[PDB]
Symmetry: C4
Subunit: 495 residues, 4 copies
């Protein structure tokens, strides 16, 4: 299958490519730009790069956990499965270092992914080649093989002891795979922000919890490593606690306890540090742990301030309204009225209807307005015998309004300028002759002033917290400007 | 009373139901939807569900406090009132587990509360049945009765010791009632946000203080439990402190001290942990306590940033104005003038008058404007002999303005465009002939240019920080457009 | 002087009364409302209430510091200057308790200060009378005198030892003066927010530092008090450290060290607590100190987020612009252009010119616009021979604009719509015949299209980051609408 | 070179001077104001002041690190290179104190840098002369020389021991160079905010990390100094740890460990403090360290809340939209539609197109609109045969719109009001006769209603997430108002 390998390196059409490049035609143009690049160029949004980086993350986490425990706590680090594990890992990392010479580079300074095979080489050499080249090759086995090639009988004096100490130091160059771990996790978390829309504070605090666990683990390995390379002098914390000859589990547990004690701000180990190794290592672990815990408090605060943002914005708005009422020295009755109005208008959380209906497109706006109000405008017989385009063009002019119980919605004797549709609540129509009718949901009132443009003949008082839709006369005239046939029909039926 | 039991399960008309469903008719429709559901379906907004969940919270808090202390610190946990307490509690929790098969489920993805008796079953089995079924039945007494049914003489060897240890482990399955505690507290705190409008940061920090006390209590019980199940070896913290045979109060006090020491970032107990049980338990308590204390700092910061939000927004606005003055390199005299203006305009706290008067309804706007200005427009004799509808339609066009002492409010010789009403402050009218009159609160000036639309004939200088209301000529013409009779009356009286 | 005492109780005219009540007439009305209240009613904004509360704060701070140290660390608390100090203090506090029956109460629910002498009595009894009545009277000396009146020879048995312990407990009822301390400090800090405009975060963090010092001091006194009332048993921290018989300075130093160690998250004292007194007292001090330190981190964060608010808002705006450029996939050259434009437009800090000039009054707006631009519009000979009212009405229509070097400010061949005035920068005018002139500060260009309304005849390219003022043709026509004489003059001179 | 020295003191034309003073002419005016000031006045924005302050910072950091270690840990502080180092340092600081009498003072209350040689003297004496005069002169060597001049044989009794103690105390007056360090670092960091636009939180947290390291270093020196001046009594921490006679490296390491332990909230040293020196010094270090660490948590939180500000603002906006959908009780299908629309409109991050295009200048707006849309309007044959000024004036009226798949972009039978250009996506044109054509990127539709102003004849449905540009009929008429020749050409070609 010489075509399937060429297909997997190219960025396939998925949710991510359609969201990045915009159209399917742009993704096909990107596939053609990968095709015209050269000999087997890997695009960093493909499927092969994804599954390869997934296997590399599942290998790097295991390497960064297993390798310091294998180096520091065990004495003979030349057993057969340990060498097998290191050689298999370094084989995968050399394969990844070769494949980095064929992967495109996503630059955040443009929308142009670099696919020039010479320019990716001249960028990867100038950016991240030295770290990956150190962390890929087994420098310790190179030093061991070269030292035994120089002297096959090197174990005569205590110089071979220094060779073993320097082997254990050079084998910590495999901890520079953290750079590739960080660069792969950021590169795929940006993609998963683009696709799935997860909260940014959750992602950053998961990243920080991962780094805190990894640094606590490395510091716990380090505070046993440095007394181990000094052959456990009588002032290190290992020999003071008489735990030189315990099992490696107890050594790792108590060392990780020292690291976590100086990380989460508790302290100490058994006693205070004594030797000059332990004092400076404890100060290093204290600096690293206090920095990581301060950043954890920062990410937790940024997470908590995004949980109730709408209700927080509501309370900021209502404190501004409290200041407005205090500035003009309003009586407390009106303050109770305004408080009840904001409790029954926004229901404790802030939203701006005008900006939200402005940001939406046209069919979503029409769909929301239809679902809200077409069941109400169908109940009026002036509108059921008209153009559906007239109704659709008229529904945009409705305004949502809220009235408290006791309010005069329509005061009798004024110029009628608005027509009201009832969504929720019960109103009372007072007319002359001491007649008081009740209107409820799905009803309407104030329609004579729309047609005739006269004055008010009856009062309307709200009895509950009424949610109403309003239609002005001027907006109705603007709707009649485009539809003159229904205007002439209203002129004839008005006769 | 076969009708009262059917009435209490249905959501009664209260402040909460009227605020959720909107109208009383919608609440009656919800009552009919509960009635047409099936055999005795409980609606989760009712009164019976409220008093039942209140009794369950008052039982769960007592259970989660008493049960770990009864398990870990006491030896013979088969005394009579302890068994009575457990059986009465588990009877109530089985009754609650049965009643969960008849409670509706409030889904936050819609406004449709599920009342289908088969769909609530198929949702509760797929969501939260296993946890409540474990935490309801006394699994420990089942294991004890079944073990004694298998072997009535099981106390011969030390196998019964293992049976008692496993009984004390299985009796901690009653601590999964925390799930029902959390789900009931969130479900009723959402309702009490809807009704009473309490600050969200206060509610969340009370929730966090509750969880911190409960986790400190459970960790204090755990750090005595795990050395107790190992029959107190000579490396646990209990036998090192020689407090195996103290009273249970001293044991609980010092264990809760260890838990709270590793929670509020202090440490340690007496000495550092020694055995492998204590090291990993101390690391667990350190992780839990550091996480809870970091979240406490986060909630405290989110609480503190909501206390002076209006004054903080004022200071952000004034720092923007300081940058505006620094950008155009204004002289310091004008900077002192602008500083005094913002001190005497907003009085240290930010509020936007135009947006607030826009967000309100029509009668509240009319009520605020009447209380502010009808005592001022009644003092002008041009307006006392006019339509009250004219005055009411004109009062909307007033604008609030503030002038510093030394300002020329009206400069003589310009086109008169505004008319000013005095709320607070004393102004000086300078005219020709070196005549300087003083005007004060309730007075007015600049009314000749409203009627005649000519030019200015006298200067007006502010002597104090004057709060004034202004009325433009163009807005007055717009008010006269709708009321032509008062316009003709002003034409006749102007003659 | 029977008039001076009546004058000092009334709120004098100062910066504070003029800012609260608005006008001097309102302050005189408040003085008349104090006069018509009754027999010597004290207004809480007066001068006497200020100097009285100042002396009470300077007495309460001394009492709350001296009294616990005198109670806990000294044995014979019946020496003569100690009794003199307590009697003089309690005399002042009884005088303050009497004067609280004549002080008005500032209610935050209205702008109406209560001055009814019966209603202030019925509010002060229902609000804060019990705490002040306990903290005012010397309950310890009452108990001592009554106990010696009951039995004059009470020192026979060890019952008098219990009497002395109960005397030292009852003498801590003087620590309820903290309520009056808090209520006076909030009441005058609100007034000093109103007058002097100090940052709110600074005031709240000074309040919190005061409470942290006072609670650390009280906890240090308490952790010596409770072992002292138990006659120093052999498990308290005092007898373990062999510091029962040291001087009181060393006892207070080490006790305050224990309190501050459990406050600022360090711990412990010498060893872990042992007795059941010390364990629960250490847990109490840990809870209080961890709460106070978490609130200190919260107030420090709220202080730090208000230091660079303008530059933070600038960076939020520029990150939105970076997202806008990333969304339309703009080339990097235009991104560098937009970056240079925002560096040379806002200079790293956000300010909105239109909203700031809208919020100001009319003379400040005229003063800023005159200082910015009258030196520029005087240099044009079309405007120096015109009405100063014409210039003043025209200057409002100028717009501030910024052009990068390389930009074509005027492109030749278009419809001339704007006229440009130069504030800063050097532009190049290119015309036909390959002629390139340089214009600099105080010059102007594009004035022929203002008069004639034709087309462009020469190009203008910016050579530096030019700050310019612009004047449109349509705004110039709007200025000519009100001033027809200068329009006719421009018609004649244009001929 | 008598001219080069006069040139270097004057502010040269660079990026900073051109950004501050605005124009090169203003910088030449500032050079003339420096020239007409007096005898060799140094301007604080020059090059000489920059390189001088750079050498002073590189000297002050070395002095504040070396001087306390040389004072506290070494016994004979009169060796030759130590005296050479102090005399060379104090010579440079006296030269700097002389040069402060010739440096201008940048005042933040205006844009006028003070260059009056008498007024800079009378400001520097009243502001910062005493601190710099103490920190410049070697007060310790003055006291030593004067004491030996008074008595040449002063080493007879133990009074010379007191002289040496007082010499080591007075030699800590060189630590008042911290004032000049802070005043130089703020003065140049303001300038580097003006030039290079680095994030403010990064700069403030680097400043705080510097102060935390310096205060930890000084506290570590102090907690050895105060036991050293008491000749190491048997209750200090030095003699308890038996480390009086160790090397100075071990003493400094363990003292810095005590300071850092009480700074990063860990504690203690070996044991608790015992003597009254150590208790109060430990309380001082605890207060300083807890304050610095709380400010570090504050700066870290302010840094973290500025990292994802755009995505945070997007999530706040979408939570407001979730509240809007919950308020009107929309069905979940429309909620999924609105969620998909905001995922495909803003792509997870908030930006406001209208405000951003309003804030830009005219050529940047034209350049962005040309790059977005001139490749689209060139493909329409109605526009390729027209004025390029017509196209340039018309391109401003395009609006960016986004449609979901399934939406009817054009519904057949309505009044045609808009014309649509396709940027991304594939649409389907349905017409009568069951004909369905596909249009893609670079195509256009709905142009007949622009010319004729009739009704719709075919439906257009979106099949993908289409990004379109729209052009209304009314905006097209407004474009034709200014260009009547192309309007007449469209009238003729429309025939
Ligand atoms: C505050 C309560 C302090 C109780 C101090 C005490 O003696 O506790 C022993 C008591 C009883 O111990 P006891 O009576 O079993 O032991 C003898 C103690 N002398 O412990 C408790 O009551 C444990 C629960 C305390 C809960 C405190 C909540 C506040």
């Amino acid at each position: 299958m010489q075509r399937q390998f060429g297909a997997m390196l190219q960025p396939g059409v998925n949710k991510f490519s359609l969201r990045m490049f915009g159209s399917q035609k742009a993704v096909e143009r990107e596939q053609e730009r990968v095709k015209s690049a050269g000999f087997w160029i890997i695009h960093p949004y493909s499927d092969f790069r994804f599954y390869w980086d997934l296997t590399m993350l599942l290998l790097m986490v295991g390497n960064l956990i297993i390798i310091p425990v294998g180096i520091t706590f065990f004495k003979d680090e030349n057993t057969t499965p340990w060498i097998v594990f290191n050689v298999v890992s370094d084989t995968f990392f050399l394969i990844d270092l070769v494949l980095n010479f064929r992967t495109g580079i996503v630059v955040e300074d443009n929308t142009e992914i670099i696919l020039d095979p010479q320019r990716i080489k001249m960028k990867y050499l100038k950016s991240w080649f030295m770290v990956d080249f150190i962390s890929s090759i087994p420098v310790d086995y190179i030093f061991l093989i070269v030292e035994t090639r120089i002297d096959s009988e090197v174990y005569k004096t205590a110089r071979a002891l220094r060779i073993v100490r320097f082997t254990k130091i050079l084998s910590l160059l495999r901890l520079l795979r953290l750079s590739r771990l960080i660069r792969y996790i950021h590169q795929w978390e940006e993609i998963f922000h683009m696709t799935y829309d997860l909260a940014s504070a959750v992602v950053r605090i998961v990243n920080l919890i991962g780094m805190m666990l990894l640094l606590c683990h490395w510091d716990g390995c380090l505070q046993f490593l440095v007394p181990m390379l000094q052959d456990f002098p009588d002032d290190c914390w290992v020999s003071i606690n008489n735990m030189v000859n315990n099992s490696w589990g107890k050594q790792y547990s108590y060392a990780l306890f020292k690291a976590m004690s100086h990380m989460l701000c508790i302290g100490y180990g058994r006693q205070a540090p004594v030797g000059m190794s332990d004092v400076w290592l404890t100060m290093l672990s204290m600096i690293v742990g206090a920095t990581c815990y301060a950043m954890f408090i920062g990410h937790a605060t940024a997470l908590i301030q995004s949980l109730d943002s709408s209700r927080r914005q509501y309370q900021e708005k209502y404190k501004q309204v409290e200041q407005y009422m205090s500035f003009h020295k309003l009586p407390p009755d009106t303050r109770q009225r305004i408080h009840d109005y904001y409790e029954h208008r926004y229901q404790g959380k802030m939203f701006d209807e005008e900006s939200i209906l402005g940001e939406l497109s046209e069919p979503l706006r029409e769909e929301i307005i239809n679902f809200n109000c077409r069941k109400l405008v169908a109940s009026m017989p002036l509108f059921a015998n008209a153009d559906p385009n007239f109704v659709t063009s008229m529904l945009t002019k409705l305004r949502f309004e809220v009235f408290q119980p006791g309010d005069y919605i329509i005061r009798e004797g004024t110029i009628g300028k608005k027509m009201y549709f009832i969504q929720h609540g019960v109103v009372s129509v007072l007319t002359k002759g001491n007649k008081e009718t009740k209107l409820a949901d799905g009803s309407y009132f104030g329609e004579i002033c729309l047609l005739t443009r006269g004055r008010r003949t009856a009062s309307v008082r709200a009895d509950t917290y009424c949610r109403l839709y309003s239609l002005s006369v001027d907006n109705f005239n603007e709707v009649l400007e485009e539809y003159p046939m229904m205007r002439r029909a209203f002129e004839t039926v008005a006769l």
